[PDB]
Amino acid sequence: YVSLADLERAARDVLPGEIFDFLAGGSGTEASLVANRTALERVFVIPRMLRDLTDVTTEIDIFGRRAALPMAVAPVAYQRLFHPEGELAVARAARDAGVPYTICTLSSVSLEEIAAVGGRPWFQLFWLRDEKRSLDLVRRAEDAGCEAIVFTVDVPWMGRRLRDMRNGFALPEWVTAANFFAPATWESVEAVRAHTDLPVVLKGILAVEDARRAVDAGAGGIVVSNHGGRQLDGAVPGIEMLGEIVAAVSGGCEVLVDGGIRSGGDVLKATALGASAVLVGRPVMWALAAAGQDGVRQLLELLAEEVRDAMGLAGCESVGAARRLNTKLGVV
Amino acid sequence: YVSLADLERAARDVLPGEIFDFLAGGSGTEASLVANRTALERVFVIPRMLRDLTDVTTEIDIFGRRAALPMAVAPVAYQRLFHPEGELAVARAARDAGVPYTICTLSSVSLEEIAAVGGRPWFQLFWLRDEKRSLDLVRRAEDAGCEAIVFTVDVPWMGRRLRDMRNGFALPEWVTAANFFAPATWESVEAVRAHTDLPVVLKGILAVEDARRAVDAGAGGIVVSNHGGRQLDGAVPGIEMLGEIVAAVSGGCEVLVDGGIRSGGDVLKATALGASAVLVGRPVMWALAAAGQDGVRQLLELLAEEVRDAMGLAGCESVGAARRLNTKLGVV
Amino acid sequence: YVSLADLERAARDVLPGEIFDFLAGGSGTEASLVANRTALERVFVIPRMLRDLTDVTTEIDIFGRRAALPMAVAPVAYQRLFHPEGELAVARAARDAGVPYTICTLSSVSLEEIAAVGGRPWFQLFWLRDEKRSLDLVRRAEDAGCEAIVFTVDVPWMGRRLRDMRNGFALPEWVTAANFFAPATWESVEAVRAHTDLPVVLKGILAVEDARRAVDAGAGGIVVSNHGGRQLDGAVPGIEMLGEIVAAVSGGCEVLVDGGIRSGGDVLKATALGASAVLVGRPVMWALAAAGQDGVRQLLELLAEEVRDAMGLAGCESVGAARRLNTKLGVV
Amino acid sequence: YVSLADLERAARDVLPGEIFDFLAGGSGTEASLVANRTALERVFVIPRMLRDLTDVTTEIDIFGRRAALPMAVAPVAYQRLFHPEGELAVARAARDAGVPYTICTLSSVSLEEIAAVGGRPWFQLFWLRDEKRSLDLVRRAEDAGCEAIVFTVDVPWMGRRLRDMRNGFALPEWVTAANFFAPATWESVEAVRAHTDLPVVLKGILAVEDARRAVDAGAGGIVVSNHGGRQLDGAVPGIEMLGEIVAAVSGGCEVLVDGGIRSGGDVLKATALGASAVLVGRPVMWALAAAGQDGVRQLLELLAEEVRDAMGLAGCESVGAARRLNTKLGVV
Numbered sequence A, B, C, D: 001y002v003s004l005a006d007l008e009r010a011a012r013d014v015l016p017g018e019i020f021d022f023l024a025g026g027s028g029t030e031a032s033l034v035a036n037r038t039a040l041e042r043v044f045v046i047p048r049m050l051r052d053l054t055d056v057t058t059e060i061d062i063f064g065r066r067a068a069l070p071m072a073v074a075p076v077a078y079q080r081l082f083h084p085e086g087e088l089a090v091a092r093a094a095r096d097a098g099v100p101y102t103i104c105t106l107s108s109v110s111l112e113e114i115a116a117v118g119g120r121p122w123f124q125l126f127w128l129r130d131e132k133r134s135l136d137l138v139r140r141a142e143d144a145g146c147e148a149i150v151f152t153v154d155v156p157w158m159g160r161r162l163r164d165m166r167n168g169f170a171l172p173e174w175v176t177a178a179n180f181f182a183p184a185t186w187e188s189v190e191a192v193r194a195h196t197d198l199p200v201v202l203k204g205i206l207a208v209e210d211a212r213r214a215v216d217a218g219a220g221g222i223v224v225s226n227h228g229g230r231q232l233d234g235a236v237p238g239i240e241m242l243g244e245i246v247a248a249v250s251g252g253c254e255v256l257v258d259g260g261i262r263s264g265g266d267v268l269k270a271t272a273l274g275a276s277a278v279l280v281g282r283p284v285m286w287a288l289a290a291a292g293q294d295g296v297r298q299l300l301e302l303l304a305e306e307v308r309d310a311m312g313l314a315g316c317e318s319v320g321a322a323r324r325l326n327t328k329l330g331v332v
């Protein structure tokens, strides 16, 4: 595989159509799904030349741990839909690559099983029916050795995914929510913050004032995101809000971005716009579908080489240097 | 049906081509018809997160009455072209959904018949040959229980609809103007205002100074509109003027918009740009053609669910909150 | 015919390909030819409503004569290429419609013959080999009753028309320059100005400072133009310079525009951007090819109806009112 | 041949696919390769009229020598891939046209052989393994009569050219680096500057501050360039940075540009944006592939005629006048 797009073609060949559509799809007309790509494609980097590249490193420190790349695997529910080893295949590959893996509340293998793989597991939270049960998922994750709580804040309920409606998609019998909902509010955030000493990271922030309030609320991070175009159809891409958000928080929490990251050059763009790191979703699932654990490993190796290549071509010996790159908007 | 576009495909299957073209078409090169869609597609919403959604409501108060959604059925002439029950089918569905229905001067069923259906009927006025006759349509509508007079101000004469010219389109013998023209001026507006205590709503305003003068003239509302691209070919879309107009009137009348609204997400965009409410035209006729009254009911149910979904995903428990959302222009 | 585009299809059917390509083509990659259309299509008009349209008139006064429309027939060389009656057919139709016709230095019928048709003939000048001969064409035109000298200033030499090169195009033997060159300068302009009391109109101005210098030089008008994309490939469209030029001359001469005018709505756009009038080239030749004099008459009747329709839909009882319309740039 | 695009079609016919792909390709998704073209196509020139064109000249003085056109042949490695005479064919044609030819460090004929052709040879440097060897290539080039050292500064390592990866491309046995690497830094630049009295020209500058530092470092020139989209995928086109860079250096060194120059009109655009001169890469290789030396001669003759045509149509008797032209950005 020489690009992430080789993995999409391979996954489309193997997966049943309805499962590929569950993975690929967005809400509504898929305007936000398409815009994630449009927005990255319009961004051009202004590279620097003639800088020392003796010791180029793609490593970052985030939430108290070194990561090999400025990237983590996004939370994607129900990974046994894609391969029989599901979450465990992906988590093992992530661990071996040195990148954090986000364990989902709707994982198809229990969070404790996945955490036992090792590595840098984070845990993604959906707010449940009651405060007490939500907090017991958080405590389970903490007890299992997860390093951060990624509280998804863009899902008061799930968006309208028309592909899934048209296909009548449902989980096969052999895929379940192995860890076993209500709209979250700022009160819910405070309940979680008070319940754990782990960093709380709010995923699905797009308004500048929500980013500021996240810092004020004691978040350790945010993920600037439209949920891969799966929630509000017409929501702005995160990449379009990122520079404004980075300025507004002015170092008060880590600022991650996701949506449409499909290469190491896209990772460079995100960092040049101010991101601490990115999440990658769909491509990880394509690799899992195509070739299981070894597929995910190959994807992460490819991304690592693309990120190193882009950084050095742009004159950046470190991710911090990449954050200081300037950008220019173009057309098409 | 899971989107309004499913209803267009269904209506195209059933209607005779020349009738579909009367419905679908615009004037000239159809530049304004296309631009209505282009303009909405370029608008992205910046949603808010973590707000209380216990009691999300899509209701609004307008012209002294509660409406179930921030939407009314636009005036569309000659609805018996589309289904044999024509206006009565649509009016019954609108009533049962709690949304206002605009009775046309060129209705194919008499205004009194349609008003007798109940609901929240408004009445759309075309200025006639003489002041006295125009005013007698207005008084008829008022006597029949219509709640607002929607004075169409963008039709000194009808635009050049080339599809209709090419097809040699004419009304079938079995469709007539069941209520049975000259260019309206500001004097005409004053004559109507003096003749009725109902709110007068000027439909087809696009210039900012015309919006201000409408308020000064005692209008209770305006509809910011290029008449669905059927009048001046090259007229700006209403959605492109709306934010400027909302600012200029600064609460002095209700500001509605129409043209290309095709989803609850489009309704959210319009409200985020400052609209009090939208009108929907073509899609209502697609539903009527496809399945009569029950079709229109299904369309309104679908729109209601899309509007609620979009509002809540965007953090809005009320339409007023939606009006306070910010937006960003994108590409394609 | 219900649009000017119906006439292009008709002309393409009848003309030999190499002649159609001589007519249709531009220089180079045809970027400026395409951009003339792109630029008009991006312009949207903000129409006004509720104004008195009792006496809508499309007439203007220009160069001391009333014209029926704010339009003249552009200079197009060698009109016998398109129809055997050539210039005389077009001139007769123009006369009968009340619009000026521009007689070309490279006309295929002598300027005196064409002037004898009557109407409002103008005369287009290419600068010759020597001052004395150039001035004798000007004096011939004046003696024949031409009303204005349209000095073409964008042709130091002819552009590179690749269609014509690829086709090996040459004039048939039966088409000649019936009135029978060097680069013009500002000195040439002064020589012409001193030689005639007719208004001198400089055609092919695009830089703002050239527009100002034209006024200072005693021009009675300019035509803001890239020569229909036939001269510099990459030259800005005139419509893109027009508003800036209108502001800079601040009423010191008439400011016409050409390039891509294909409807009465395009005429309205040009006037809203500040043009006194437009020239129309290719479409007049399409009508001539399709149906001779009667074709040109039908085209002018169609344009007159489109201009009246657009003006009134936009609330303009006069061309001066149209000049006061505002515009908004859109997309696609 | 009447455009440079006729030469691409001819080269595609003759070359083996993998060699055509080595020539045509870019890195990654080829976004920067495409953007070079997009960016030029969006630029429109505002031509001037009525200026004296008695003695139009396309000549410039650069690096102490007259050149016939504001253009040089870009460095392209391994020209024997394209034709058996390789570099010698191109160098002879360049010499006979009066335009500089850039001899590559990775030339397939030795630099001394190519320099012996005569003309205005420049020499392109890739930084080697050690300072001493790099400097001995520079001294070789100087001893052979090269006039400038074009130090390529955008290649710490070669970009990821996916076409070449997919094709498994390798040099045939009969093509070698006939003159026979590490990342260059600002120290490397100083070492070269101290070693030669020839002008040092830094090729691959895109950041404004890198342009300024180049002047401060004693460069005689820069080439504003993204390496034809072959290095960082997502790097801004040089043409998009050029105006800003020209302003920042404020005459302190020559400022060249490359990437996508495909006509004399593109040369005019570059000069209007402030370039001293352009480089042309791919098209020279197309001509070499199509017809060897005589092909390159025909290409240079065509470009010379296009540059003269564009300059004069734009009112420019000299390249300096062309630099004073203004431009406007358009769409598509």
Ligand SMILES: Cc1cc2nc3c(=O)[nH]c(=O)nc-3n(C[C@H](O)[C@H](O)[C@H](O)COP(=O)(O)O)c2cc1C
Pocket: A022, A023, A024, A036, A074, A075, A076, A077, A104, A105, A106, A124, A152, A203, A225, A226, A227, A228, A229, A230, A258, A259, A260, A261, A279, A280, A281, A282, A283
């Ligand atoms: C099939 C699928 C399932 C997802 N499940 C979750 C989830 O359970 N929790 C969550 O916070 N995000 C979820 N996401 C959103 C991703 O975490 C991420 O925001 C999104 O996929 C955008 O990134 P991409 O373009 O890299 O896929 C899901 C995405 C997909 C495609």
Ligand SMILES: Cc1cc2nc3c(=O)[nH]c(=O)nc-3n(C[C@H](O)[C@H](O)[C@H](O)COP(=O)(O)O)c2cc1C
Pocket: B022, B023, B024, B036, B074, B075, B076, B077, B104, B105, B106, B124, B152, B203, B225, B226, B227, B228, B229, B230, B258, B259, B260, B261, B279, B280, B281, B282, B283
């Ligand atoms: C077939 C048809 C007939 C119409 N008749 C009228 C009318 O009688 N009065 C009026 O004010 N508007 C009329 N309109 C305009 C609509 O009220 C509305 O402004 C327009 O359809 C734009 O909305 P849409 O894109 O939702 O269709 C008509 C529209 C259509 C398509």
Ligand SMILES: Cc1cc2nc3c(=O)[nH]c(=O)nc-3n(C[C@H](O)[C@H](O)[C@H](O)COP(=O)(O)O)c2cc1C
Pocket: C022, C023, C024, C036, C074, C075, C076, C077, C104, C105, C106, C124, C152, C203, C225, C226, C227, C228, C229, C230, C258, C259, C260, C261, C279, C280, C281, C282, C283
């Ligand atoms: C076939 C052809 C011949 C032309 N000949 C002349 C000419 O002799 N003199 C001149 O000033 N312009 C000439 N023009 C330019 C036109 O006057 C006008 O500027 C141009 O056609 C743009 O308008 P259009 O898009 O309406 O064709 C010619 C145009 C065409 C298509």
Ligand SMILES: Cc1cc2nc3c(=O)[nH]c(=O)nc-3n(C[C@H](O)[C@H](O)[C@H](O)COP(=O)(O)O)c2cc1C
Pocket: D022, D023, D024, D036, D074, D075, D076, D077, D104, D105, D106, D124, D152, D203, D225, D226, D227, D228, D229, D230, D258, D259, D260, D261, D279, D280, D281, D282, D283
């Ligand atoms: C096949 C190929 C080989 C190249 N080799 C070199 C090189 O050895 N050194 C260098 O500085 N640039 C090299 N370049 C880049 C060119 O000098 C130039 O920057 C680029 O081709 C952009 O111009 P174009 O669009 O005119 O091709 C190469 C380009 C191509 C296409």
Ligand SMILES: O=Cc1ccccc1
Pocket: A077, A106, A158, A227, A230
């Ligand atoms: O978009 C995220 C998602 C998560 C679980 C089920 C369906 C969708």
Ligand SMILES: O=Cc1ccccc1
Pocket: A126, A127, A155, A156, A157, A158, A181, A182
């Ligand atoms: O159906 C899954 C879900 C997840 C979070 C909130 C609401 C629903």
Ligand SMILES: O=Cc1ccccc1
Pocket: A039, A040, A042, A043, A239, A240, A241, A329
């Ligand atoms: O307007 C900001 C922006 C940022 C990234 C991509 C597109 C737009």
Ligand SMILES: O=Cc1ccccc1
Pocket: B077, B106, B158, B227, B230
């Ligand atoms: O565009 C509105 C309309 C109304 C009646 C007849 C024809 C068209």
Ligand SMILES: O=Cc1ccccc1
Pocket: B126, B127, B155, B156, B157, B158, B181, B182
């Ligand atoms: O033909 C219908 C009509 C309506 C209003 C004004 C003029 C004409």
Ligand SMILES: O=Cc1ccccc1
Pocket: B039, B040, B042, B043, B239, B240, B241, B329
């Ligand atoms: O320029 C304002 C605007 C508003 C909505 C859509 C497109 C443009």
Ligand SMILES: O=Cc1ccccc1
Pocket: C077, C106, C158, C227, C230
């Ligand atoms: O573009 C104008 C023209 C005029 C005469 C001959 C060829 C072209």
Ligand SMILES: O=Cc1ccccc1
Pocket: C126, C127, C155, C156, C157, C158, C181, C182
């Ligand atoms: O070939 C026609 C012509 C016209 C004006 C200037 C130069 C050439």
Ligand SMILES: O=Cc1ccccc1
Pocket: C039, C040, C042, C043, C239, C240, C241, C329
């Ligand atoms: O930038 C001004 C403009 C004017 C008309 C069309 C396109 C652009």
Ligand SMILES: O=Cc1ccccc1
Pocket: D077, D106, D158, D227, D230
């Ligand atoms: O892009 C330039 C190049 C040079 C030598 C080998 C391969 C590529």
Ligand SMILES: O=Cc1ccccc1
Pocket: D126, D127, D155, D156, D157, D158, D181, D182
């Ligand atoms: O492979 C060729 C090369 C050239 C310059 C730097 C690194 C590699």
Ligand SMILES: O=Cc1ccccc1
Pocket: D039, D040, D042, D043, D239, D240, D241, D329
């Ligand atoms: O924004 C500057 C620019 C310059 C040339 C082409 C495109 C953009």
